Amino acid sequence: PLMGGFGLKHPPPQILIKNTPVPADPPTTFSQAKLASFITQYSTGQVSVEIEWELQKENSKRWNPEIQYTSNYYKSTNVDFAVNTDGTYSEPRPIGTRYLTRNL
């Protein structure tokens, strides 16, 4: 994929969910028209997704230290990757996946 990712011929199936329609009271005389009146309704619940990942461990003879991803040492008004005073979670920066080096 050009956005980056894992191209999959059979990706994880997409899960579809819908509230079953519940009709409001029909008339007492028969009518062929479909029922256009429903009870206003919504649903809530919990969802768990669990992915097992396989890792390729870094094995390298490089003598000097690697570059690592580290948080800023200096003081700040609020912590990065944490809620603010109002309770809003924010992500300060995009975090790329490549800090390690290999030989080309």
Site for its own copies, rule CB under 8 A: 1-3, 5, 20-28, 30-32, 34-35, 38-40, 42, 44
Based on CB atoms, which residue is closest to its own copies, 44 or 68?
A: 44
Based on CB atoms, which residue is closest to its own copies, 42 or 53?
A: 42
Tell the smallest beta-carbon distance from residue 27 to its own copies (Å). 7
Based on CB atoms, which residue is closest to its own copies, 28 or 103?
A: 28
Tell the smallest beta-carbon distance from residue 89 to its own copies (Å). 9
Q: What is residue 38's three-state secondary structure?
A: strand
Torsions phi, psi of 29, nearest 5?
-110, 135
d(CA 92, CA 84): 12
Burial of 87 (0-12, 13-18, 19+ CB in 10 A): exposed
Tell the smallest beta-carbon distance from residue 10 to its own copies (Å). 16
Nearest alpha carbon to residue 11 among 57, 56, 51:
51
